[PDB]
Amino acid sequence: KPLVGTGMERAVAVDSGVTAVAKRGGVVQYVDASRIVIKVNEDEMYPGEAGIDIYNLTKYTRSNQNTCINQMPCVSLGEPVERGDVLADGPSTDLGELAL
């Protein structure tokens, strides 16, 4: 991350779709190098489902300019998240901030 920035970095890094943002908040059941499994809170949970979201991280996919695209998970085991936080840093993001 830049030590000198603007605060637009988090907006660019989330809005680019290159990270993995959390659709429904809750707690993190299982982290991997290629998967994040989030147990949803029962408030955001719908009355006809289980409340388990799966995020399949794209690893070492090629970009158009032959660079590297992989999603590195930035959460830990048993960490509570909310709706709209970053779960996986993209190619050149760091904890949800743009890092070129």
């Binding site: 991350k1 660019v12 779709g17």
Partner: protein, 47 residues
């Protein structure tokens, strides 16, 4: 917040923000929404 409680950037701006920065890809997504979407009378796109 939760991804912001782990590292908070020190802000040096002295003016408040009364309007947040919008969704940065509203132009493409909204234009293709108006093309692909089913509208009854306000004629847009395929209809």
């Amino acid at each position: 917040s939760y991804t912001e409680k782990k590292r908070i950037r020190k802000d040096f701006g002295k003016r408040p923000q009364v309007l947040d920065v919008p969704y940065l890809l509203s132009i493409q997504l909204d234009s293709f929404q108006k093309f692909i979407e089913q509208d009854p009378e306000g004629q847009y796109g395929l209809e």
